[PDB]
Amino acid sequence: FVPSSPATPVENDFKRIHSISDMTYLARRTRDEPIRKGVIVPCKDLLDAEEALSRALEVLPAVVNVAVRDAEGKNDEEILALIKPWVQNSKADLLARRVRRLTFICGRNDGSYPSYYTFRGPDYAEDDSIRHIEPSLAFQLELGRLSKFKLTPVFTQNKNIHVYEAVGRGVETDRRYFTRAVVRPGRLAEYLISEADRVVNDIFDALEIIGTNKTDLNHMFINFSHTFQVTADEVAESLQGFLDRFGPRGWRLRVHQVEIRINCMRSENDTMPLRVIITNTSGFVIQIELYEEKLSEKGEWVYYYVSGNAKIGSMHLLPVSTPYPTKNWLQPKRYKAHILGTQYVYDFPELFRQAIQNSWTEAVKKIPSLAAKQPAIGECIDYNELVLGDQDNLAEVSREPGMNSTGMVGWLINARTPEYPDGRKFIVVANDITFKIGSFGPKEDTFFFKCTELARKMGIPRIYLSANSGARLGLAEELMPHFNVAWNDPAKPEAGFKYLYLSDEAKRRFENEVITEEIVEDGEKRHKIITIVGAEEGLGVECLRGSGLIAGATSRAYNDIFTCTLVTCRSVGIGAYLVRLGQRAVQVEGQPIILTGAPALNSLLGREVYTSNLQLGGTQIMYRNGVSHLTAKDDFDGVTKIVQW
Amino acid sequence: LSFIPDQRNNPLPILSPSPDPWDRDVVYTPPYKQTYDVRWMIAGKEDEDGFQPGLFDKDSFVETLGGWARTVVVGRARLGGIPMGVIAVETRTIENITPADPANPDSIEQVTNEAGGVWYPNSAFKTAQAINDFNYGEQLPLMILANWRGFSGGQRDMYNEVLKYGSFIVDALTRFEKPIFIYIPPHGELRGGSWVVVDPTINPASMEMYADEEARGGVLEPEGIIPIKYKKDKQLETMARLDPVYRSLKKEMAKEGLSKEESDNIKKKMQQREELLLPIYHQICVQFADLHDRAGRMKAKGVIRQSLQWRQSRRFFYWRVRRRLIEDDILRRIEEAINPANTSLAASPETRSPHLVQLESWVGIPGFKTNDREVVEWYEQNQDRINEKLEKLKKESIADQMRELXXXXXXXXXXXX
Amino acid sequence: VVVGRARLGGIPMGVIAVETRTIENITPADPANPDSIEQVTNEAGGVWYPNSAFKTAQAINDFNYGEQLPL
Amino acid sequence: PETRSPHLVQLESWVGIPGFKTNDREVVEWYEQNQDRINEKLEKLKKESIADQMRELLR
């Protein structure tokens, strides 16, 4: 023996080729690696199998499978104590040939699926994770959706189903039981609905014997190998039927969600895989999310839902490699923002809900009777995230807080204000101060623009929450430990250098990352660097182009729709200007509107003139010269003051 | 009035190349070491040894507002007969002295040094005012010899609303109608805060950006990025790589087997070698960071159309200004015939109008987006064919509007009456 | 000059009024020039000053673009 | 402002209040009551203007 880019639904970064069962082989590059070898050893008996191991390895200068033909005695643990003495004995035999995986196939004559045992690594400690499943079957099971967890599998009576005790790698408070099952098609319409009942009851009976114990949440994944003609609209109607019967039992086991993966030939014919997530949020399911597995044109398989739900659910257009977030994961980010004296970006929707809650509580006092249109604590605001689509075109998503693909986030909020109690909409855009200093990259610019563009097109006001570090700075890190220097004198390098060149071997490595000219010096093929391009984006002019675009956009927007900015934290460079182009601005007392850094001015002057960023950017300057329209005590007081506008 | 069209929406008072021909190479080139009078690059420099002309017609430049914010030069000039508006940056450190207020006897004249190639509240205001002047009524093409390294970030300049007047440049640029050419000249710089307020994505329908082959432009100066992206430790990792003495000394510390008095030797040998290599190793990173801010990189990231040679700038702009002025008018006339009543980073002047795709096929020249000279000559020859295609489109659009005039049931009532 | 937004029997609208009292804006000392001290300036009431006129002009633009409020 | 729009002469005759230029209170109350009658006459004028627009497009 591998495509690892246009292959079966997987995720690949830069240049890498990994295995199906072994998700982490070698990422470095597969330009220099020995070809994988496939070996299959059919042995009559478990004891006689040892002779087809020590002699089997002799024709090996990789993957080795071992088939057993004794359907008579199917041991468990006793089979493990019968295969471990052969692996500990030949611990150096299997090691020398450099084979990664050692699988075992054990079939029964009554129609029972074969049992698999896989040994992997240096000592081959036997990963309990891959059991009763094939390397092929390791893909459907995925297990790449549980990278943020420390997995320890537990015994299952049915070889098809596998249960794992997942614990949060960082914080230990997270303890969940994740189920992973594979249904293989029966050889030779009401088949699948009854098949679902049999496999889910088997999972329910297995979760019962291990016990509910202490689990915050519980999930189960069921992947289908058969491509039976699925009409999801008929599947959804039938889904409602059996979930209300199993639901009570699943509610006792502390199961919160279930994910099914079905292939539909009714679109031979193209098989469109349709995933479905059913979550038991607020005691009653009311979450039937019917998705569609399609490529994002970026090389990722994403979650496009055409659900039976009101489309205000969760998770939309996200890659198939999601790691199922662990609780308290949001907290470390919140800390990075809170040390700077600003609320974490995703905590703001809550601040706004309370400010609207506050706007009613006073209006009911001032104006008695006319109060009954109040929409309670919740339902005050109806927010939905904004993330750039496939074709650079924005869409309404209701996914989990955080997990922002860019250093900029937007929302479409329908706040039921006392002025418009039936609803009023607006856009809110903010920089994630934790995501690369909150600096403006091209991704961040294209987003900010498309948001301004939409608020304009709809006539609704736009609110910008500034907490940034101007444009993104950068140099090419890949060319730092590769570039060579050509001196006037090689013995004394301090005697000046002629230029900077790149070795021919290191020149072919990039070529498109650096513009090089060839000039023979000292009889060497020296490719002198005449200009640096760099592979990574957001280093120079690419940022300035985008910054200029959003600068003009804000200038245009102010003249059409209501534009407002809020200095929740230090607003530098381009960010500082968007506050002025946004015209109407609220400055939080301890946040500066700076252009050039306080120490950067001291270094330029050659003397310690300014000591603070607020000594030239603070409220005592901007509110006193009319850049700031109002000064707010805290981040919330800012929100409150804009709610009043 | 010699520069201004006789009416409102009338073409400019252009004449033949006549005194200063279009087919001449720009002789005056500015020095890279010291400061230069930027005015010499526009009209020409009077020297002891002959006279070296600028990129515009000899003595055709007329400077205005020259007594206020001299940090930026504003005026009108002719390019081979074609009149147009000019904005340039003064490189020399000018000094404006504010008079003493007689109303307050405790007021004295304040000596202030407006350092060259920087934007100040008054300089930004001057820029913003000039732009409005050249578009409203005047309606002149604009040439900007961009050389600012940013904005004055000083407390006094900040308190003096530098941010407010900076925005007024951006506001004035979206308001513009006629073609605008942003050209970074040789030695010219465009760092941080400066670039943002002049980028072609502000008004892509009328802006066009070019840069000199030996011009520089980045987010920050190569001397400013080095203490953030190429710190002391990053330089020493590269020192223990290129320098043979430093990496050999590094192999001594790594091997161990040497006492407390022995390990002190290697430390006192390296922390003397690295102290002498540091100034030249610093300058290496400076050259390295400058290669990012080079002209080639700009065209590669598509922030500019083409890299330009200062020598043949006059020759290029004469046909590109002429090509754009005739084209802009034809495109404005296409829309006036079609409807008798831009959207991305990709918005480049070659995709400034959706009628340029239709006009492209009507012309029939392969190098249409380029070959500015060949394009101009074609329009002059096929003057009847364009007027012919305009009237074709005018009658085609009248047929669409009359068909659209629920609306059928209403027309059936207005006809029965 | 006093600028703001207020309600007239429920109807919201933009407001511009003139301060009658003699206000005093004190410009801070420039630290860049050690020969710079804070300047005490008395903006006498009911008069237009460069900053006051600018404030007026800015407020008007604010109340029309986007906001679209009666003045 | 009593002559701020040339449609105020047409709107004056559609309303029918004598103190139209003045009696601000009486005017407001009328629009609220005859909101459907305005939308009725606006439509009568909308069809009227479409018929003339076709004559301009041929001339």
Residue numbers in the entry:
A (entry chain B): 1133, 1153 to 1212, 1253 to 1379, 1386 to 1464, 1469 to 1846
B (entry chain A): 1847 to 2187, 2196 to 2259, 2300 to 2311
C (entry chain B): 1918 to 1988
D (entry chain B): 2203 to 2261
Q: Which lines from the publication concern this structure?
A:
To improve crystallizability, we generated ΔBCCP variants of full-length ACC, which, based on SAXS analysis, preserve properties of intact ACC. For CthΔBCCP, crystals diffracting to 8.4 Å resolution were obtained. However, molecular replacement did not reveal a unique positioning of the BC domain. Owing to the limited resolution the discussion of structures of CthCD-CT and CthΔBCCP is restricted to the analysis of domain localization. However, MS analysis of CthCD-CT and CthΔBCCP constructs revealed between 60 and 70% phosphorylation of Ser1170 (corresponding to SceACC Ser1157). The CDN domain positioning relative to CDL/CDC1 is highly variable with three main orientations observed in the structures of SceCD and the larger CthACC fragments: CDN tilts, resulting in a displacement of its N terminus by 23 Å (observed in both protomers of CthCD-CT and one protomer of CthΔBCCP, denoted as CthCD-CT1/2 and CthΔBCCP1, respectively). In addition, CDN can rotate around hinges in the connection between CDN/CDL by 70° (observed in the second protomer of CthΔBCCP, denoted as CthΔBCCP2) and 160° (observed in SceCD) leading to displacement of the anchor site for the BCCP linker by up to 33 and 40 Å, respectively. Conformational variability in the CD thus contributes considerably to variations in the spacing between the BC and CT domains, and may extend to distance variations beyond the mobility range of the flexibly tethered BCCP. Comparison of flACC with our CthΔBCCP structure reveals the CDC2/CT hinge as a major contributor to conformational flexibility.
Biotin-dependent acetyl-CoA carboxylases (ACCs) are essential enzymes that catalyse the ATP-dependent carboxylation of acetyl-CoA to malonyl-CoA. Eukaryotic ACCs, instead, are multienzymes, which integrate all functional components into a single polypeptide chain of ∼2,300 amino acids2. In addition to the canonical ACC components, eukaryotic ACCs contain two non-catalytic regions, the large central domain (CD) and the BC–CT interaction domain (BT). Here we provide the structure of Saccharomyces cerevisiae (Sce) ACC CD, intermediate- and low-resolution structures of human (Hsa) ACC CD and larger fragments of fungal ACC from Chaetomium thermophilum (Cth).
